[PDB]
Design a protein around this nucleic acid. Structure first.
Ligand SMILES: [Zn+2]
Lengths: 81, 151, 184, 129, 87
RNA sequence: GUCCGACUUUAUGUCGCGCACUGGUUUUCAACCGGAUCUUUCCUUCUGGCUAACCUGUACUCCUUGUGGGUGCAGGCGAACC
């Protein structure tokens, strides 16, 4: 503790700490490419989305607002961006 | 962690990513993003809702990253900036709502104190927007002006 | 078409680079249709240690957009044609001194024309294929400064050995030494 | 609110020295902090510090070696005439043989001895010894 | 410390903590001085030849004595990777 | 170089304080301050003075064939100054 690296702390400790508290502050969020069983369009959505995101082709919601991050619509298949 | 008008000490916020430039995975066009912003504004949406719509339904991380200008700046360049700034307008709406609740029931003193707090915040924000000359120097806040601006 | 792609007084070495650009223009389906609208601002040569050399082409800057879209291909083909000379697609930006109070008012100097901003842009465009993900600055005990740049581990394969030459170019541009490091 | 950033930097240095550490993490990292730590490096009271770009005020990581014993800002940057330098050194520094009143002159941020060598004086920043 | 002609006038130029570089007081009755014996090729502790580390009473009271000794022994090639410079 | 303290009515040869005054101070040194210069690096710039000064080249070379050195007139250096 008396001698310790702050310029290069362990990446495990990086994921340990809070956002806004890293060496350089970086968001923990990410984007997703979701496909709805309806059509073949790939929709880009946010992990912590705040709106009932729907595909422009069909009036089917793909996410759902939540106190934290998005909860999907039980049938959409996603890939992390 | 200041909480200007209360004793709160929270720091819940958002950390802007280090890289200013566009994300590698984004394939959209800056001109198309500007057109989308213009259309959303013409629908009658404030810049914050425009940003939230671009972040949720599309891959726009933030307008300044993609276009190079800010949302309100983009609207102003096209002459769609509202005559009252969005935060001040929302404060006006909240104040008129609490005043309505007050005049519909007198005995509630806590909402009276909250209206005092909201009016103080309105005065501070109006002073700021007045020294920057966004609002005319004669702009001020009294009763029945908040309703006129809101309605 | 040698003279058109350089908006500067001719120099024997840069004519060869222009001819190489025409030879690049010979290939139709991907090296044409964008490359016609090209210019130059007096490409210059920077000596690298060990006998190596770094040519630095200087974009007028309005063409940077196109240059940036084209860069990777043109770089590898030019390295095929130009041996031992690493080619770097640098911008040219007007650095303005600050108004001394005893100097006279001209105009509000935009911050993009300033030394640190211009140097940041130059170092960011010293390499397209990789992106700067971190910037550290260490001041040695003896009184000299080093600007470590942390580059993405992804897309590191493009710059396999140009790093050192990059250093030299920045040094030759600034005198501010620089050390490249790639985080794990 | 953060009024004097250099005060926060020097307080962090003092706290992380008294506890026996060898490093500090100063958050706001202005020009004045960089110049202050550079002077301390020049005079040996500090080790090998570091600027960490965040695109937002940056930060600084300071390496110590236990040689320092106290930093400290004179928070009201008093206009110090060239006659009043000696009074400040007497009131702040523990001995005449060492210690340095770091003060900002028109010729930059400098230790009091260097300022007296240039025969120039300005406002006072802090003191190190 | 130094007389103008050039002779020392100080008495007992004091020791310093090997982990925090702070001097050791004359009456610092918490500080210790560890001796680690040098080891030859066949594991025979060579007598009268060792390496000394002066740990201050402050770090011992705080609780960083063993960690500091770990680091200090690792630096001078006594223990293999017992201490990591990045926590 | 200059030289003075131990050698006492004197000094040098001598014992050097490692030079009591004055220089080479590019002996590397090391600073401690400046000044000018190159950066896409300006320090208010011109408009006439005055052209101070030689990027002037007109008549030319005083003198070793040597750009050391000049008598000198239209361009033309203005911070050397009005
Ligand atoms: Zn569908």
């Amino acid at each position: 503790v008396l001698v310790q690296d702050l310029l290069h702390p362990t990446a495990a400790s990086e994921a340990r700490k809070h956002k806004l508290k890293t060496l350089v502050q970086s968001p923990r969020s990410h984007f997703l490419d979701v496909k709805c069983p309806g059509c073949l369009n790939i929709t880009t959505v946010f992990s912590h989305a705040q709106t009932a995101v729907t595909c422009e082709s069909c009036s089917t919601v793909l996410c759902t607002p939540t106190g934290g991050k998005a909860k999907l619509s039980e049938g959409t298949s996603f890939r992390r961006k | 962690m200041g909480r200007m008008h209360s004793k709160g000490k929270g720091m819940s916020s958002s950390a802007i990513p280090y890289s200013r430039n566009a994300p590698a995975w984004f394939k959209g066009s800056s001109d198309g993003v500007v057109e989308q912003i213009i259309k959303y504004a013409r629908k009658g949406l404030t810049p914050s809702q425009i940003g939230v719509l671009l972040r949720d339904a599309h891959g726009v991380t933030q307008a300044k990253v993609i276009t190079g200008n800010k949302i309100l700046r983009i609207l102003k360049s096209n002459g769609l900036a509202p005559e009252i700034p969005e935060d001040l307008y929302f404060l006006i709406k909240k104040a008129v709502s609490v005043r309505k609740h007050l005049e519909r029931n007198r005995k509630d003193k806590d909402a009276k104190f909250r209206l005092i707090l909201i009016e103080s915040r309105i005065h501070r924000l109006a002073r700021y927007y007045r020294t920057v000359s966004v609002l005319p120097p004669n702009w001020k806040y009294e009763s029945a002006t908040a309703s006129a601006l809101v309605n | 078409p040698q003279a058109k792609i350089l908006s500067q007084a001719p120099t024997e070495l840069e004519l060869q680079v222009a001819q190489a650009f025409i030879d690049l223009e010979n290939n139709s389906p991907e090296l044409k249709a964008d490359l016609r609208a090209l210019q130059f601002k007096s490409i210059r040569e920077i000596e690298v240690a060990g006998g190596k050399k770094a040519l630095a082409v200087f974009v007028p800057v309005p063409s940077l957009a196109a240059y940036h879209k084209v860069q990777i291909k043109l770089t590898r083909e030019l390295e095929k044609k130009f041996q031992d000379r690493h080619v770097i697609f640098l911008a040219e930006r007007r650095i303005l001194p600050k108004p001394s109070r005893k100097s006279r008012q001209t105009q509000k100097r935009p911050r993009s024309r300033t030394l640190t901003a211009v140097h940041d842009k130059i170092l960011e465009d010293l390499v397209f294929p990789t992106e700067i993900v971190g910037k550290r600055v260490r001041y040695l005990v003896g009184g000299n400064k080093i600007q470590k740049i942390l580059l993405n581990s992804k897309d590191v394969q493009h710059i396999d050995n140009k790093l050192e030459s990059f250093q030299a170019v920045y040094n030759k541009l600034t005198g501010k030494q620089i050390v490249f490091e790639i985080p794990s | 609110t953060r009024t004097s950033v250099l005060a926060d930097a020097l307080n962090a240095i003092n706290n992380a020295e008294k506890t026996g550490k060898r490093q500090v993490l100063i958050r706001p990292s202005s020009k004045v902090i960089i110049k202050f730590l550079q002077v301390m490096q020049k005079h040996g009271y500090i080790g090998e510090f570091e600027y960490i770009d965040d695109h937002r005020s940056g930060k600084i990581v300071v390496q110590l070696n236990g040689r320092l014993n106290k930093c400290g800002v004179i928070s009201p940057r008093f206009n110090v005439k060239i006659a009043d330098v000696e009074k400040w050194t007497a009131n702040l520094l523990p001995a005449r043989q060492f210690g340095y009143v770091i003060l900002t002159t028109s010729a930059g941020i400098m230790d009091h001895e260097e300022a007296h060598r240039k025969h120039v004086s300005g406002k006072i920043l802090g003191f190190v010894y | 410390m130094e007389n103008d002609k050039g002779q020392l006038v100080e008495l007992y130029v004091p020791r310093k903590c090997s982990a925090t570089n702070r001097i050791i007081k004359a009456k610092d009755h918490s500080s210790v001085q560890i001796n680690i014996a040098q080891v030859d090729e066949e594991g025979r502790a060579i007598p009268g030849e060792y390496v000394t580390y002066a740990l201050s009473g402050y770090i011992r009271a705080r609780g960083e004595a063993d960690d500091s000794l770990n680091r200090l022994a690792q630096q001078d090639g006594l223990l293999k990777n017992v201490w990591s410079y990045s926590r």
